[model samples]
Target: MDKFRVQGPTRLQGEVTISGAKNAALPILFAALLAEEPVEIQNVPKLKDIDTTMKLLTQLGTKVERXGSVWIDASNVNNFSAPYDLVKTMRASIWALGPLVARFGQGQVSLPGGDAIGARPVDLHIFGLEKLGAEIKLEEGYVKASVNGRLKGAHIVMDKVSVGATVTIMSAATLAEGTTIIENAAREPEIVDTANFLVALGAKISGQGTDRITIEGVERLGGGVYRVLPDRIETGTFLVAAAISGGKIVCRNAQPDTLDAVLAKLREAGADIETGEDWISLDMHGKRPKAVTVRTAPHPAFPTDMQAQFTLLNLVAEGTGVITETIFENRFMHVPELIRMGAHAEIESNTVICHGVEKLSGAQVMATDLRASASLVLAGCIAEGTTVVDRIYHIDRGYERIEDKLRALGANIERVKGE
Candidate 1:
């Protein structure tokens, strides 16, 4: 295991080039299975989840190669299943279920039950597929799937919009036999990016960033080069980090429209916001307001993935802050870890209440998840002394070269092997 050992009161200055969207790349990687020719994905993040999905592709016999941000060649995969060992760790691994079925006509993916949160069922993914003319059966912790003839797309109205389900079904239905329409689909930019990646490869997809998405199932999709959009959540993560810790960050190539809610909140909290053609800059040199309220939702709304880091930022606010996590229900897994680091915050059911304190003293904290790991790092950077955050693998899954980026910006951060 690895941990982040950092000396505190470090002001992070300068810019960190955000990598390709981890959320966008995952589905796009699986969507490549729909093409018969090899697809090239650029700006790939070197995260654990990305590595895991790449390994899964290799296990399926794809000639996978990574050079910088590009993943070259994925047309030779012989299998059409998402294995249990991989999917069990992160729910996003289920994204393979779609492309596998599209390319090979059948896919068996392990189902991931809700972990550390509500009953995060793949029912939406399954139900949506069933509506698209595929027979689905759940047995032995795997979703055994088979399509009769060619898949004829139908209208799938999600009971509750799930980003995973939206991405999986969109990628699957895009290559089906007939025109498929997904109404009230998830409105996240990652979904739009996944659709764009498929489009760049000859799939006819429309209404990517809107509520309704239409996919004209082509007979075949050709291999081509596609560059993923910058990760908005990752962009928001750094924006919050830079804002909360009284720092400045230049996040490049980020989609400005994707984070309007987060940006609004940051500005409301008194951070200086600036934007350019392909970058977003947040200046936090001045003392920010006491607290900020938050609520999580689908796209064009506050993302749940950022709840933890924003909560950490709220710890330094002037007044009490409240956060309602409507997306994951139990996403405050980082609260206890933050409390251990001297943050005055408490969670009441789905709502996390924050009381701003002048200073958060240094203390050892454990990692909970991806954003939780980021919160600890942000807390450590602003702490009075040294703080060590263990279980950096969680951090590694999402953020690329975090310590290096922070260090380049003048943060006293170090990555070390844990005892």
Candidate 2:
């Protein structure tokens, strides 16, 4: 395992370029299976989850390689199996289900496991697929889906607003026989990015940034080069970091428009934010931020992914703040870790009530998940003395070279192995 040793009370002042969205890249990479021609994907973040997905692709007989850009040629893919051992590492393995069944007519994907956040069931994916003429069953912890000929499209009313289910069904409907209508679709930017990628591959899709979407079946998808969108969650993290430690930092390759919810919160908390077409600058040099209530919700609202790091801002800001997590039940796993570092916080059911402290001293903390790990790191960045964060492999699953990026911005953080 690896841990991050950080020397805190340092003000970050520099520029950091945000990485490509891991959430967008995962589905877009799997979307390659919908194409007969070789697809070239650009801006693919170098993450452990990406590596795990690549290995899963190879396990399913698709030749995946990277030469500057990830080149995936699924034209000669023969196998339709995603093994249990590989799928157990990342929940995104389930994304291969739709593409596998759509392109190859049969697929056997192992049930996936991920962060200890909550039970993100794949029932929606199954129900949506079955609506489009797929016969799916669960046996021995594997999802077996098969269809005779091409799947016939049907109207699917999603039980919930799930990004995974929306993208999975959209990919499957791309090659179906008729038009598919998805009600209550997830309107996340990653979902829109996937739709844009599918459009590039010759799929007819519309209403991507809304709760409902329409997809017309295509004969087949053609290969094309697609650049993934910037990571809004990463952008939000740096913005929160700036607020926590009075840092002046510019984040490049960031989508400012997509971050209205988080940026609005930051501004309300007294951050001086400047935005451009593709960049955002956060200056919090002379002022202490005020605490603001944070609520996690669907897109266009404060994202659940940003809740953890934003909670760190609440820790050091003025007054008290209430963080309500409506998306994931166990998202406040970082609260206890934050409390370990001398912050005053209380958990009341699905809400966390935090009373802002003047400062926090460093403590040995454990990382729970991708975002939770980031919250702990943000705490260490502003904490006094040395802070050691263990189980940071969870952070590597998403963020790309996070410690190196923070170090470039004048944060004293080092990654040590063999712990």
Candidate 3:
């Protein structure tokens, strides 16, 4: 295991290049299974999850190769089962279920396991596939799906707009026999990026960044090269980190519009933001951030993935704020971790009430989840003394070399092996 030791009361300055979206890369890696030839994905982040997905692909007999980015020759994938060993560690591992059934006619992927933030049911993924003419049965903790013939497309109205369900269904629809329409689909940038990746390989898709996504089924999708988009969640994390420490950061290769909600809230918190074509500069030296109300939802709204980091921002901001976490039931797991660092906050059901504190005193904290780990790091960077954050493996699953990135920007953070 690894932990981060951070010395705080420092200002971070310099330009940091954001990596490719992990959420986008995961689905796109599985999308390679739908291709007849080898597909190349550029700018993929080298995170633990990406390595896990690649290992899963190799276990399925795909000729996977990674040098700088990644090249997956899924043309010869002979297996259809994602066993417990591989699937148990990554919730995104379930993403392979759609492409496997769509291209191979059957698939048996173990029920996924990842961050313990919520009871993210694979039921939605199952329901969406069943709507597309696939027979789904749960047996021994595995999702067994088989199709009689080629999948015939149908209109799927998701019960709740879910990004995982939306991406899984979209991948299955690409090789279906007819047109597939997804209403109330998740309109996140990662979803749009997956749609674009599929489109490059000859899948006809439209209305990606909207609630209604239509896919025209093709006989087979060809292999092509596609560049993954920058990680907006990571972008938002650094933005919040900058403000939390009263510092400045110029982030490159980020799409600012994709994060309008987060940036809008940061602006409301008195951070001076400067935007350009591919970069965003955030400066918070002369001002203290004010609390902002937040409610998590589907795209074009505040993302639940960012709720944890933003909670840290609100914990030390001026005045009080309420965070309603509508997306996940137990995402406030970070609250107690922050509270350990002397943050003033309390959770009432799905909402976290934050009473602004003038300063926080550092203490050893434990990471709860991926985003929660980021919150602790941000807290450690701003707090008065030394803070040690344990279980940073959660942090590695999402952010790539985060300590290195913070170090480049002048943060006194170090990673060491832990017992």
Candidate 4:
């Protein structure tokens, strides 16, 4: 285990490049199982979750090589089961369920467990697969799925907009016998990136980045090289870091268009933000930010993944703000931790009322989930004293070299190894 010791009252400044999107890369890496040849993935972030994903791919008999870029040869994958030991650590393990059954006609993946942030059920993934003519059963804590012949395409109307379901079902639909049309699909940019990767591998997909998507069945998919998109969540985090620490930073390799909602919120909070084709710059100095209210929802709205970070921003701002998290039930796990640092916040059902404090006095904190870890780190950067954040392995599952990135921007943060 490791923890972060962050010194407070540090103003971040300079340039930082965002890493590849973990959410986008996870599903694309799993979707490689649908290809008949080797797939070369570029700009894949070096994160614990990606390592776990590569381990699962290797366990399934796929050849995985990582040397700056990742090359996966699923052509020789003979195994059909994703073990419990691997799936228990990362929920993205469920992503393999789609391509495994789509290409091999059968697969058994252990039920996934990830982040204590909320109750993220795999019911949607199972529902979409069953709609695609796969016989699915829950046996001994594993999802066992098998299809007769190849999957035959069918119309799937998702009860809710789910990114996991959208990616899984879309991957399976690529190799089906007919066309598959998905309604009310998730419109996240990550989903669009995954769809583009599948298209590169010869899958006929259209209407990505929208509520409805159509995928035409193809007999086989071939491998190709594809670059993962930049991490939008990380970009947003650094933007908030600048505001909270009263600094200036330019995030390179970031797609500004994807962060419209986040940028709007930052602007509302009194951060001077500018955007280019592939970069975003934020400057906050000489003045305290005003509190900004936000609601978490599907893409084009505020993201659930960013709720915690923005909540931390609200805590140090000039007024009160309300953050409503409709996507997850337990996302406010960071509120108590922030309160420990002399911040005032109260949770009512799915909403949090943040009372901005002039300054926070640092205290020992524990990271509850991935984004919660990030919010704590941001809080530490602007607090009055040294802060120690434990259980940072959750943060490692997402951000790539977060300490290094923050350090480059002049943050006094260090990682301490523990036994």
**TM-score versus the correct structure, for each prediction:** 0.90, 0.93, 0.92, 0.92
CA lDDT of every candidate:
0.81, 0.88, 0.88, 0.90
lDDT tens digits, residue span 81-193, model 4? 99989988888898989898899999998875444634556888888899999999988877888998899899998887888999999999999999999999999999999
Please provide, for model 2 over 149-249, each residue's C-alpha lDDT reduced to its tens digit, 9 standing for 90 to 100. 89988898887788899999999999999999999999999999999999999999999989889999989999989999999999988888888888899
Best by TM-score: 2
Candidate 3, TM-score vs. the true structure?
0.92
Cα lDDT of model 1 overall? Answer: 0.81
* Candidate 1: pairs in clash: 290-317, 290-318, 290-319
Worst 10 residues of 2 by lDDT: 112-121
Residue 104, candidate 4: Cα error in Å is 2.5
Q: List the residue pairs that clash in candidate 4.
A: none
Tens-place lDDT digits, model 1, residues 1-419: 89899898877678888888888888888888777777778888888878887888787777888876655466677777778788777677777777777667788888665465446567677777788777888888779777856777777777677788889888888778888888888888888899998888888899888889998988778887888888887888778877877778898877787788999989988889988778899988766554888988776788887788788888877889899978676688778887877778778988989998877788889876888888899889888899998888888877888889788778899999845
Index of the highest-lDDT prediction: 4
Off by over 4 Å in 1: 110-120, 137-142, 288-290, 346-349
- Which residue pairs does candidate 2 place in steric collision? none
